[PDB]
Amino acid sequence: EAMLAKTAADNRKSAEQVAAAQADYEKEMAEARAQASALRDEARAAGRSVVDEKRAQASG
Amino acid sequence: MSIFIGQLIGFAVIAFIIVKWVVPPVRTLMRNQQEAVRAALAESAEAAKK
Numbered sequence: 632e633a634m635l636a637k638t639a640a641d642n643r644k645s646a647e648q649v650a651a652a653q654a655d656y657e658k659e660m661a662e663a664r665a666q667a668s669a670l671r672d673e674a675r676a677a678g679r680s681v682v683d684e685k686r687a688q689a690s691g
Numbered sequence: 692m693s694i695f696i697g698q699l700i701g702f703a704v705i706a707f708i709i710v711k712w713v714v715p716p717v718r719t720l721m722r723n724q725q726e727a728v729r730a731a732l733a734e735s736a737e738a739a740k741k
Contacts, residue, residue, distance in 0.1 A: 634735050641738035 638735040638738045645741040
C-alpha cells in the first residue's frame with residue numbers, strides 16, 4: 632500500500648516538476664529581460680542628460 | 692473392500708470435476724492477481740524513473 636501511494640505521489644511530483652522547471656525557467660527569463668530593459672532605459676536616460684548638459688554648457 | 696473401490700471411483704470423479712471446472716477459474720484469478728501486482732511494481736519502477 633505504501634508503494635502504491637509512493638507511485639501515485641511520484642507521478643504527481645513528476646507532473647509538478649515538468650511544469651515547475653519551465654515555470655522557474657520563464658521566471659528568470661523575465662527577470663533577465665527586465666534587468667536588460669532597465670539597463671537600456673538608464674543608458675538612454677544618461678545619454679539624454681549628457682546631451683542636455685552639453686547643450687547648456689555650449690550655450691553658455 | 693468393495694466400498695474401497697467404490698469410493699476410489701468417487702474420488703476420481705471428484706478430482707475430474709475439480710480439475711475440469713474449479714481449477715480453471717481459480718488459476719485465472721491467481722494469474723490475474725499476479726499480473727496486477729506485477730503491473731503495480733512495474734508502475735512503481737516507471738514512476739521512480741520518471
